[model samples]
Target: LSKTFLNELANQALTNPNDFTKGEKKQESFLLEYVSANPTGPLHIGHARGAVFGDTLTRLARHLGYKFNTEYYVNDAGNQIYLLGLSILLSVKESILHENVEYPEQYYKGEYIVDLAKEAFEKFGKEFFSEENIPSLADWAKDKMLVLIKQNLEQAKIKIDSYVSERSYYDALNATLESLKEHKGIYEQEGKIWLASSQKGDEKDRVIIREDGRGTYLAADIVYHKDKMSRGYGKCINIWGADHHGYIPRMKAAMEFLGFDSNNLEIILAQMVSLLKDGEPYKMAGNFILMSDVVDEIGSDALRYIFLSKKCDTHLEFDISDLQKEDSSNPVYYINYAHARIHQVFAKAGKKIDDVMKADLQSLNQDGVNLLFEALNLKAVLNDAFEARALQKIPDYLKNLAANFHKFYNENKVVGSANENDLLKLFSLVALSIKTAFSLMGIEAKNKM
Candidate 1:
């Protein structure tokens, strides 16, 4: 495991990698990840956990000089969606058609789908809500939810290179299943062929397809993993929820059994995020929309900042009030403000020093030289985050970098300082760092305050 981890380190040693990651890659490109909430509703803070981390990691990888591919995975055809469609079906009959109906315990009860019913009713009308009408209802909601999902991506300023469908992988998985069987890695058990879960140290035998002839969830993932590998990606990473934590090994096990390097698949398990407001933890799942509430309170820049500020490997609790505090406490505005001041510092430098950045960097004293050292380390921080798949670290790096910038700003001035020539060089270096960090995170490093 340590040797595998060092592969990225080795890559970094061979050539100058980008600012954000140190992972050694035999090839120059990677498919970063595909993740988050099943496209059931608008993405909230809960979904933002992986979305922010993965998007940041992807951006960091690209910055590291690794050609990268980003993806949005859809579970549009599965038990999960089956339940969502069922909810829409029930909401349709009772809310739109005025039919006497009782919501099923297994069905989704959240008010989010209430509108989904009316939307479906408006198009396909009342008959579509009946049991027999589930197909059309499911199809309709699939397209609608995808559109909403695209909207959420736009809001986050995150976009993927591809949107892969678990549903589409169902048929193609037969080849993966056959290959697994050929390797004698799976066998027929209580009605279905089970992957040799024991070989991989999994707790239970995983099903390729359930008894009803529908494919098991893990079944298609094996093929999808195969598909990803077939596309020439050197490695693949997945961000999944805590509930699916148990399924990790079986997917890895299936991957190896299919003749692909299962070691290439990396899974980051992000725990459930329970939001808090006023004081109480919003229990189970609730009515308050996370993306909307956070954006409403603090604006998009701050909201986006909060999401990227955590290590992907650790658990995060996004209290609603974290965005509301003053400058010293709230990190959101502080980081951006640092960038604004950098622009101001450059403004103070007269014609030559300001105009073409013509000042010599060597005129600076030891303290100014140290600041330059810190500023140039942005590349190392990015590589660490990208290879580790722990993107939250980059925000911490930026926060510290911003503070260093401010300290440097307060202690010296580019226009009036004795080392005006030296200060100009330092200012350009600092500005380079801040701008790169913000741009990598899909943030704005502005011209002025």
Candidate 2:
């Protein structure tokens, strides 16, 4: 019975590959926002993890025939960029005068800021330094950092279709304030503007603007979503860090105040990343692990694969020691080896599987047929992943498929037999399935170890 089902699957896939991924579309646009890392510094491990999650989710959605746009919400209009400039100018003055200058409390003092100071001085000499010029310098630094960010994204091969700047919505932010007032979502309390988020499911009402009239992060974010709504996306999904879990209800309330169904907005809060090396927590710059350092140590494929080995919402320990391993102890090597082993079998045979492609597939026994059956689960895996938005399921399924293939290879013989052709056909399907799965995960399935 299992053999009959397996042959039917192979025949269906051979006849129409789309049958393996048959899906119905909702006929609505989906705008997925993720890794909106502040152009403050290099992307950390958390940023990288979120990027993989969002990018892979977008890939799966697109494969399912949904119109989706991948976006990076750049927090460029925030006060942090201004602080970056102030920090750079002060640090540069300290360096030129050869004096120890203590940075203000809550000021950014990263080495990258120091480099920006150098670049700033080189371009605009000491005469250009002033309080008024700081904003211009900040703008320049933000642009430079964005370029660096694009480089890191390029290195990771995470392609973003759009980049929305928070500053772009500054003029439009007041629109939200008025909309909130009309909806009774905003109220004035002690000279501050507050959002009635408590009524909308938040822990409490949160401030949208300070007493001084400056908008808060939540205010800007609402306008950003309003901008997204203007794009006519039926659904908006944001992948944010777990730290902002409290911000969800307020965002939902803001969406409702802006005249849209708050339920249409989905937020995936990704957890933190703890880097460990050989059973010990690795030391990093202020406990932040740069994504580039990890990619430099282990290639992007391993970095991406490790980030995706676990669910996004779960606390992830990125084990450097385990990632460096090239043996079965490493999931990357193990899965790749399974895929590569197929090419080895074909290359060693020095023959074609054209005959096997047409074979009746009856030469293989139950175990061999079972392996092919496991590969057939790729269809169900894709559908399951799409519905649940759990891309980690694909890697989990691939690992099991690869393990079963290894077990079958150890227990059976495939070369120099009349059954070779038939087994090759079955194995070919397994290889195709593995490659297809890996492609969705943004990892390469090696043809050779």
Candidate 3:
């Protein structure tokens, strides 16, 4: 299952490599970034939804303002990274020694590691497993994992404007540590340096650095947040997993201690996703399913629609059974069908769409007029989504628009009527509206379902 998914991911990634924003829209004051997953393995389905949410929010933010940069923070400098390298080397040793490599108690056990192990073994023979060569191997695995992550993002049609490295901050780590000391935010407690988060309303203080020279995860994150502020973003937005809820307050505390506006840093916690196929869970408790596998089976449009159908704060239950359906039960099909049916109407009329500006609004019946009215309401719906951090609203609105357009199509006649020309004009407007909505949401509006 894992091998098939990896191949499909690579194919899908190469098949579509479009950039996020073409022509480089106006300068952005707001900086948004998400899916800063640890470079441990291939990104799972949960990261897929977070990527869609962040990129879609960035799209809407482009409309709200001129400047925004979407970034991904690579977690390449930590014990987890070292553990990733160790895991691969251990796999290589175990593969050579015996069959099973399950002796390591708490290491990553994903099949992708097997691929990395074989690749490392082929590249370095037996030298890559040596203690002196482990650091180099660790860095190599981190870089390779980052490449795979970027490929997955591209497969999902998410193009980040920047790739920030957590390793890069080490050059100024000493300076960052001194700055925290200058602010009286850091203190030596026992053998560890702790951040006085409790002073800022946190339940407990967190250590920034252990007794050893290595800094803790919170230390790297503080420097990263400081780096984000140094990038000159008036507002920094981050979409994080719901599991990281406990980390938010201390993060805000660190920011306040750094003399920055804590309120300017907004963290949106995205909830979990449950995949249901054939009305049953896709994977058992200890089993896993790759994001690429889901996209390979359902296409990017359906995967994104299922994710966007639910709010960021709400649990998303991805029903593959419904996604594969063709009728109104499937939001992707319903929306695409509504868009394509308008073209069908124009095809039947034996006439092309005219300018919507000259459309006869008075000629359309109440249903047609209502569809037009709903089309006009897209601006408000988008505004609401932005203000409320509600991406679910976009799909909800599209579903409503699709529903009404389907109704208008079934109830009225567009061929050879007194309002024939004007009805085609309305059809053109409706179709354009649906296309625009889908484009903003990062979902494809197919000409046919």
Candidate 4:
């Protein structure tokens, strides 16, 4: 509220625009894992929710001077991977070989499977489709699916810093389990190895290895998490689907058993996403609705903005058609338009942002002062959003700032006023905030809408 505070904010915005935490103390290193989707299919809207949320949070953390590493844990060593291979083999037999084969109730089915089958036939020839070769086929297809997953993420402009494969950690499983045994974190029960998670707060002890001598998913996850902690991160954060909320206590218990602090492992559950088209439920052929399809239609900016516009733990339902609108009803359009409008104002006045850099921000009216305050509040908003794991706060702030900017523009005469330079300076700061915030959200601000 004070002139000195406002002036300092403006100076920081102009000189060190990207570093939002210029004066704040630096934080410790973090390992953030999210969108650990199985390598059996393309990312759907469900995965996109966490993908966008995690990526935006990573961006925010880095901007806030936190040492953060974003990772995608690929679930490539489970029954799902075998099912992926079986599905492709079935497609090859029924569709390519023209053989009558009844599809299993649990196999992955989609046009993508048929496409992968065709590509497999071309790449490996017909003999590789046998059951003995299914393991090889599964490995190959899993790798291919990971490529597609990466492409899908790239389409949304999401970049993961590292990818830790479940299969790669198979060799470490025995040692990891042994370490847990040494810590008395696991016990044998009815010819199976169980994690003694109930003692640490889980409802019941969970199985780490089955009687058939194969490790369970929880076992693999324990190994993965052990590797994560060994990397010496101050904290390990996982953004899992809401359905996996129940898995948290057991995982935390395992961490404690591994001689680490369970408090250092944080799990944030991201809820589901419901898509609509023209105000009705969006329907897709089969059970496959690729996130790339929506990104292709509405674009990365709209998808990223809308996904982050809500709390991650709450159900998000939105009409994709709404994003296509060019009007203010679309928050993406409204916020970016605010940025574009500032440039337009500068254009009309035959001046650039640098032209108003020397203007006195203290000379502005109460309305102008309020607008400046809102624009400059981006730093505090980002810090709070990161701290609360409420990324919606960023977009929410942008929306209100845009609304206030629109209101201020509607009420004031900026281009031809006696205080034209002052207004331009204020608008410049607002645009800077918009651009910086959008960048942190992995969205590009439009200079022209």
Residue-by-residue lDDT tens digits, candidate 1, 226-257: 78877887777788776878778788777778
lDDT of 2 at 436: 78
The stretch of ten residues in a row with the least summed lDDT in candidate 4 is 18-27
Off by over 4 Å in 2: 2-5, 11-28, 94-102, 284-287, 352-355
The pairs that clash in candidate 3 are 27-67, 28-67, 28-68
Q: Could you tell me the lDDT of residue 199 within candidate 4? A: 92
Measured against the true structure, the TM-scores of the candidates, in listed sequence, are: 0.84, 0.91, 0.88, 0.95
**Cα error, candidate 1, residue 7 (Å):** 33
> Candidate 2: RMSD over Cα atoms?
2.6
Q: What is candidate 1's TM-score against the reference?
A: 0.84
Candidate 3, residue 155: the lDDT equals 83
Model 4, span 1-449: residue lDDT tens: 79667877687787666664333546588999888888998888778888999899888888887889988888877566898888899899998999999877788888888999999999999877888888789999999999999999999888898988776887998898889989998888899999999999999999899999999878888898999988988899988889988888999999999999988998888888888898888765348778988897889998898889788888898888877677678999999889999999999999977788777777787888999888778878888998899999988899899999999999999878888998998998999999988998888898897
Runs in model 4 with CA error above 4 Å?
Answer: 20-25, 78-80
Off by over 4 Å in 1: 1-28, 78-80, 109-111, 125-131, 272-289, 318-320, 348-356
| Model 1: per-residue Cα lDDT at residue 290 | 58
Steric collisions counted per model: 11, 0, 3, 0
Model 1: lDDT of residue 279 = 72
